[PDB]
Symmetry: D2
């Protein structure tokens, strides 16, 4: 089958020379990356079986007499309504090409992996700016929502309610794409925004090629940005956020929280105003008590102080985000900082340097409490990232098949705390969607 | 408390002379109607329950130095977020006044009650036109959804799923306002419209002063029209529709159904193309079996051919509507009719003449199978209208308290079927939302 | 020939009943008025020969299968570009129907001629409001421009330059439609507005059925309002104006100035802030000296104080209008008055009562200086109005043909001043466009 | 004085790093180019006359606490109204920086001067695309207008009349910026567009750094593009055009004409459909007689068939353009070409290679009738380009002051015709605006 799509944006202005350049066999890595990201978006209705299921799917950007076409060959039929692609999906496909070509033409893999801290931040800024994500005529308004991909009905309803109350305050939502808690808040917000007659409500999705197949963008996402890697996505979250709401989740939400806390612990960041709320329904009380205990036992009370826990109160969560926008606006003004990008935030290179989750790199992590606590948070971040990769990313699953489980080790008492945390994730269904068993991609050496 | 609202529409250009006129003793009934309709909109989130709970609520239209203001005095607090009126609620309040003054200035009560069929039809047209509801450059896209105010979770989810799929087909939603099945489809469509990047989605609510407190408008409605009475609301539904979806419901939904089948049985209406779908989840199969059987044994197996029943298939419902629009378009074109208003539909005055729910009038109904089927449908419409009024309308409740239950009588076997249907509505929780006991305002004389 | 035009506005929503009502022989006066106003607009590329030139022109509003059409039969071909009506002309035709039907359905000729002062002002307000002329979210911005229909190249260029400088300040222009000084400022302003990237620049045309054929709306007019008569047009000018610019002109511009000055002389209007500038090119110095002398010799220095004369300085004229907007804004705020309509302005019924320019009524005017000077201005207004009517209006030219010239009399010294003023108008080509002789429709009895 | 301008476009998102880069010694020539191009835009209302008059003018792009600011230091006061920058001027300043940084970052001087034909063509495409000038969903509507900067009142009025009639046909205008015939059509079109209610009318100005001070952009231009050099400006003209109107002019207009005829004579261009109209008022008949004769006696009577001459008929010019668009549309469709960019037009490198106006290069031109006609046209293009540069460009004026007049030589009879044409340009006041004497920067060796 063939869907020959006429792009409405910049793709419609590619020259024959540019198309020939993209189709050159020397450019196949970039062209394949595009194909793979298109598939993730089209199949949103984890990487080791979905890339093997639509093996016959291909793209072909081609100049026809009537103009440039994006041909989709054997696409998921769920992306179409009477053989016409869902309009939001079309927009997301054009977004995908935009980001892949922009990054591919400006930055080498050496730039992206091995540049200094300042350069890696500028890369994040440059990609966001080209995506038209950054609006200098807007006051703080963006709430980043983090949470589990795999959550029950009670938890899911709670995320929708929180999103609804946030939308009623006229605030926008940014998530990392995907099901569960990364979609619910956006759906809820669409209701809040409609009641408030909000035009141009912003639903920001930030992703990267490694995670996009496992956590794919729903077409309610109206601004999609593909960052080059997981570290640049994390940086995009914290540079764009004006507030952060964190629901219960698994290893991915564990990774984001440790990223966030490790950075905010930094002496240079004590000045920051950035409201962070951990929140869930009444049933999540035990979850949050134990997570708060984990944070205290690992990186200390200097980190526990950075957030507030609100249980079973969607209106209060939204009130906190709303009061927070005023404090953030005041912070950026007083600091000579932009509303649209938090330049004053100080992110150490241990939080930016791209981590390749191999068995050697995972074993080399220093998980002991005689470290500066910011360094401990950095390595804990990398450790959760390896677990995410071994669970859902294509290359990560490959590492598990050739070497077996990752070995995570460190100080006895800390590894005992980590072992309990991860067991709780498995037990609560947080590591994998229902329907089959979860086999851990890791072992914690206690 | 006081909320002093600055109107953005025509209320902003009322003169002092005109405000004085509205506040005159001669217009006191009309000004109260406005106060009562405002209250219904503000406390949306039965017409004798909330009126004794907001006795202190008042409105006051006044010219101030900075312009005309709508003062809400002791309004329901749910209508406000941080002390500012929800924007859509302000839009609803403005449409209430628009309709009340329009009707109040052009049509006397005698005109509304006693005019000929064509005049009544032109009254409905006039109000809808004034409300800016009629769009001459749009092809058929309006789906009317009817169903119960008191439905369970399975039924509510199905209404949202259906609304979603209709929204994916780019179509608009019209309901009678209020909770349950009159709310679900709008919520679903919002998401479907979002995926399809639909600009200017229409969520049309049609109501009237008698029913509005019992079925109050949700701010998700972005075009509200208040018709003078229930009969004119019903005419609005069937003249604006391009397709009708009917979910399980109680007495209101039955009133609507018999109104529709009654009119569609007409000789002059055999030409009409109007898709009608009765639909519900898997668990509603028994309900529709019994409903279909009721129709066939009252108004005949001919009337059963006017609709298709679809159980447990939301995409199929939307496909049937989408295909239906093409036939509706062809029908209107073939007949030289308007897309925006079905002028060719023949509505007999027995469906238009406003029915006052009194014991006198209910007992004088001819519920006999030897009545011509169109006339039986019109009298069944009236009987259902009386149950609605007895249950939830202020002046219907008056008759019940002063004279006891309505008595409904007719031919023995027809009364036994009616008794069975109404018993099934009571049993399935359709006559009243959970909390208190339902006390029947009727007794079927078997 | 037939141009069958599909209207884009409310005309597209007329019912067959409404069309039959309009076409009834009892409604032919109203339908003919429409026809006549359509012709004036279509022939903009004085009434005694243009109504006789397109005798075969007719309108036919008709319901076709595809919708309501405005059929134009034998229209001026200048209104069309390849047999497609100029879009601005279409909009003006729809405006024409809107105003004629609104006034025709709400007000009898008895209302319009014989109502009290307050009622006649409300009529003006009601028609403007229905025309959507009044915008309560705008601060003062409207400059009314008055001047000669028949002016030379130097004078015309000057009006364009003034309009350009006004447009550069973001101010809008209101004129009474027609050639010469009533078009130039709008053309100039279109350039100023474009340079300032003004969206929704407002070009307001105010006319009435008597003068519309002689001074017809150019399609650069983007808001056209037809008032019922010349007095209601004059009232519309002064109720809408936030500033007034007056160029050299003939009897029509003489009429407007005397209207304006007579009102502003009133004790109740001394409070008003309303910048009035008389202005022209260097050649107009003698003109303005003599007009200023006429004002002094008739109504006194109490009137000369109400305006400033600026010669040969388009930038200063615009600066004065711009400073004036601030003073007008301050006036309306301090007075609890609207920005969009000057309600506080006090207009005596001598300025409102519709004057029928018959020979008996003209001779009955009291043109002596032992009157209150406001009453003298009122009668001077009526006298200039009779001259305009006898020169260019259809009924006025008829009065001249059956009775000969109007006889204007009064006090010797005053009539000598008037005789010199009118001779100067004739001498300067101000009474009639070039190409034929002007024969005065009046005699001043000296 | 200081005007600190807040940019609304991409300049608002320059980073401190990027501003530091622009201010580096390595980018000094580029930053000056921006200053010089800003000055030209600000003092619009020859490239050595105004540069010595605003020596104190400077620009300064700086990050302030409230955002990025464009400081204009001692700017021309004409660019300001009450101290605020004219909005369209701000838009022009923003487009200048957009183009200067785009070209400056992607193309070295060697690339611009020395690349192959296809690369040069792609450079023009790239800049126009970046400028958002290319619209893939629009059918042909762009009329390029060429003509003299120094024209009398009769000629200027005719250009406005032509612009008016083109605007009435719904078409857009492209010029080379500057006064006279490059200003008139835009002013006329504004009015024509206004009558036709054209939303988003396009007034495209194409310029380059050498010519911009001599022909500075009027703020009526709403899309400005600065191309790297005159040859690329010329390519932009002919690749964007859907029709060309050529008014009387001097050396610049002659350069343009011979460029066009030179390219249209190509074998590969015989397929092209591009309406070309030479037009002027009644008084220009002699000019066009002599011009037509010059063309026939230099490049042949074949080349004369490429254009139609229309004298004294603006409506006929617009009709010929409007009909032309239909043929242009059909041509592009038949050939599988774009509407927005004429990719099929063949442009020989002799028309593309940037020509530096030096005595060496001018004398090395082959102006002989036994040259192939395309090559003669390309060398005549170069000769006219040298007169333009000698008259009005900074570095062209350099060569004249250091080495005296250019000598132009070739075959005796061709030189005698060239001498005659240039003498006629000087005599008719076309080489220089009134005020001072024109001193020829050339001598034709006869």
């Amino acid at each position: 089958s063939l869907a020959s799509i006429s792009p409405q944006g910049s793709m419609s202005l590619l020259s024959q020379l540019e198309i020939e350049r993209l189709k050159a066999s020397s450019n196949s890595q970039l062209y394949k990356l595009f194909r793979n990201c298109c598939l993730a978006v089209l199949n949103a209705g984890s990487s080791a079986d979905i890339y093997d299921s639509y093996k016959d799917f291909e793209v072909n950007i081609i100049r026809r007499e009537r103009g440039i076409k994006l041909e989709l060959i054997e696409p998921p039929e769920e992306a179409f309504v009477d053989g016409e692609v869902i309009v939001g999906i079309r927009e997301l496909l054009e977004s995908v090409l935009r980001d892949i070509l922009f990054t591919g033409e400006r930055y080498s893999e050496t730039d992206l992996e091995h540049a200094d801290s300042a350069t890696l931040t500028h890369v994040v800024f440059d990609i966001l700016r080209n995506a038209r994500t950054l609006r200098p005529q807007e006051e703080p308004n963006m709430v980043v929502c983090w949470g589990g991909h795999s959550i029950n009905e009670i938890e899911y309803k709670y995320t929708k309610d929180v999103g609804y109350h946030i939308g009623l305050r006229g605030l926008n939502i940014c998530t990392g794409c995907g099901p569960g808690a990364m979609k619910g808040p956006m759906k809820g917000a669409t209701i809040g925004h409609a009641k408030q007659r909000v035009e141009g409500g912003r639903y920001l999705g930030l992703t990267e090629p490694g995670i996009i197949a496992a956590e794919p963008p729903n077409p309610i996402v109206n601004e999609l940005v593909i960052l080059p890697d997981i570290e640049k996505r994390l940086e995009a979250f914290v540079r764009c956020a004006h507030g952060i709401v964190i629901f219960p989740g698994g290893a991915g939400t564990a990774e984001e929280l440790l990223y966030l806390l490790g950075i905010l612990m930094h002496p240079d960041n004590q000045r920051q105003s950035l409201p962070v709320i951990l929140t869930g329904p009444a049933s999540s009380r035990d979850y949050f008590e134990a997570l708060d205990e984990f944070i205290g036992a690992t990186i200390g009370d200097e980190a526990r102080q950075l957030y507030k826990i609100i249980i079973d109160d969607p209106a209060a969560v939204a009130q906190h985000m709303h009061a927070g926008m005023a404090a953030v606006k005041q912070y950026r003004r007083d600091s000579g900082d932009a509303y649209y990008f938090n330049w004053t935030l100080k992110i150490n290179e241990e939080f930016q340097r791209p981590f390749s989750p191999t068995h050697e790199n995972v074993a080399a992590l220093n998980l002991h409490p005689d470290q500066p606590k910011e360094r401990l948070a950095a390595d804990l971040r990398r450790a959760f990232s390896a677990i995410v990769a071994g669970n859902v990313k294509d290359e990560g699953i490959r590492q598990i098949r050739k070497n077996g489980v990752f070995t995570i080790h460190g100080e006895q008492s800390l590894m005992k705390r980590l072992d309990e945390l991860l067991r709780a994730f498995v037990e609560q269904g947080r590591m994998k969607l229902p329907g089959s068993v979860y086999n851990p991609c890791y072992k914690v050496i206690t």
